[PDB]
């Protein structure tokens, strides 16, 4: 029967489709490793995908995946048990070491570029015509931590020009320096900006950026990682 041949054929096609999808989804992180970093014996029934290349715009080079996988950065963690399956505890300051919920990835120390080769993210004071068009404007507002103490004041807004959206709030600290705060980790209010992830004294520990007009992917990851990590490492305060 045709209907019978059809459905039978579809299930064959589907098994082949799933096989393809799973291997496509192994272009990052595989092969699997033992907790000591060495390759793991069991890699599953699905084989490693064959290399594919991405030619990045603006002479940024080419990415090949799968490929030599390495965390080009030290990991301040230690095994908690002999066997596998147990937590690895931070050897130092998780927040400062960038581990656990405060982890960051060694991305390119370059700014994400827009389609025309310009910095994607930029402080409003450097983006002609950008302004708050709705909602409360956090600029000039005090930034308060989970300790209820004021850590500083909002001196600017870093916007994703292409998407026209607020991504970072630049906060000036007592020492007079500034730090970027992810927009999705703050709560803008009528009189202040509340940050539940950090305590006022921890804002200084937020990794700093080199240029005052741009931010690299590497820095964005350190900033975001550090801030999100406060939810677990700055909660006691």
């Amino acid at each position: 029967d045709l209907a019978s041949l059809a459905i039978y054929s579809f299930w064959i096609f589907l098994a082949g489709l799933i096989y393809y999808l799973q291997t496509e989804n192994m272009r990052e992180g595989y092969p699997l490793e033992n907790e000591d970093g060495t390759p793991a014996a069991n890699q599953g029934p699905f084989p490693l995908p064959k290399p594919k290349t991405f030619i990045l715009p603006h002479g940024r080079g080419t990415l090949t995946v799968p490929g030599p996988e390495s965390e080009d950065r030290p990991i301040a963690l230690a095994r908690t048990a002999v066997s596998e399956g147990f937590p690895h505890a931070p050897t130092g300051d998780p927040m400062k070491d960038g581990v656990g919920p405060a982890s960051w990835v060694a991305r390119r120390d370059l700014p994400e570029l827009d389609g025309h080769g310009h910095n994607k993210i930029k402080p409003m004071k450097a983006a002609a015509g950008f302004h708050v068009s709705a909602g409360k404007n956090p600029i000039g507002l005090p930034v308060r931590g989970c300790d209820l103490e004021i850590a500083g004041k909002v001196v600017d807004i870093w916007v994703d020009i292409p998407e026209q959206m607020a991504r970072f709030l630049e906060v000036e600290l007592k020492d007079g320096s500034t730090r970027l705060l992810p927009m999705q980790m703050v709560k803008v209010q009528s009189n202040r900006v509340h940050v539940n992830a950090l305590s006022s004294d921890l804002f200084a520990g937020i990794p700093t950026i080199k240029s005052p007009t741009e931010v690299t992917l590497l820095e964005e990851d350190k900033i975001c990682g550090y801030v999100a990590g406060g939810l677990m490492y700055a909660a006691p305060k």
């Binding site: 991405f54 965390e71 581990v99 292409p162 999100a228």
Partner: protein, 281 residues
């Protein structure tokens, strides 16, 4: 085993119950208190299904069917073989689904991310609870819930539906369907767009988000944006399930007739109700 970048994330903490007593993984799976709880409920639920199968006299997954108590049992407990199994299995499932959600929450805490996922999963649980608990309770009997059988639960959908004529006329059902269709449309478009940007024409450099925007702008005159599309996808699928639970929680509780009759608040309207002509005149 671990993904090459996973180790730095497998730190202690994030639990809601049991401190570090269950703070560990089994293979890739995180356990946690809710993990052992899920295993418990799931194991007991599966064992009871197997028991119901021994009673049914079949091992075929196509025939095994666990029916709820008869309507005569109202909301009371029933004997294992006559619906009790369905009642206990329903309790185990609810415990398993809820525990699964709380386990996700712990996972969210350990990774320091938002709780959007378990929050979203809760809508599905509420939809399940609507058909198996809320509606049955409001109608006065567990027997109004669906049976646990691959094909028998479809017959249930059919019988329940036709009990009200053509279910297509349930206005809340229309809305849910529109969200379901619009969702699949949006998922297809979003997957396509990203892929078309990351895997451009041959002989071209990987596209940027701007190309995605320009594409949808040229095509339909508006780009919701990278953030917007994920927000929309979540909203479409959640709204679909919401209107699903809604179209069922009102059927047989505040509505009892053929759903097509509902549309009279528009047709039989006093004035034009009698104007000659059209389809209803």
């Amino acid at each position: 085993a671990l993904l090459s970048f996973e180790r730095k994330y497998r730190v202690p903490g994030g639990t809601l119950v049991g401190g570090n007593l269950f703070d560990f993984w089994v293979g890739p799976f995180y356990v946690g208190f809710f993990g052992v709880a899920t295993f418990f409920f799931a194991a007991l639920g599966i064992i009871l299904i197997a028991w119901s199968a021994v009673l049914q006299g079949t091992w075929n997954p196509q025939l095994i069917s666990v029916y709820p108590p008869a309507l005569e049992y109202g909301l009371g407990g029933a004997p294992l073989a006559k619906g009790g199994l369905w009642q206990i299995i329903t309790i185990c499932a609810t415990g398993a689904f809820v525990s699964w959600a709380l386990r996700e929450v712990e996972i969210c805490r350990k990774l320091g991310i938002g709780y959007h996922i378990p929050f979203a999963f809760a809508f599905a649980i509420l939809a399940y609870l609507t058909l198996v608990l809320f509606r049955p309770v409001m109608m006065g009997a567990w027997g109004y819930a669906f049976p646990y059988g691959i094909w028998t639960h479809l017959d249930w959908v059919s019988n329940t539906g036709y009990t009200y004529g053509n279910f297509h006329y349930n206005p809340a059902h229309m809305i849910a369907i529109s969200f379901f269709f619009t969702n699949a449309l949006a998922l297809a478009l979003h997957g396509a767009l990203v892929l078309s940007a990351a895997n451009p024409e041959k002989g071209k450099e990987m596209r940027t988000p701007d190309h995605e925007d320009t594409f949808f702008r040229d095509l339909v005159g508006y780009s919701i944006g990278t953030l917007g599309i994920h927000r929309l996808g979540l909203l479409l699928s959640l709204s679909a399930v919401f209107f699903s639970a809604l179209c069922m929680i009102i059927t047989g509780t505040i509505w009892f007739d053929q759903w097509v009759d509902w549309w009279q608040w528009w047709v039989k309207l006093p004035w034009w109700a009698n104007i000659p002509g059209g389809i209803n005149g």
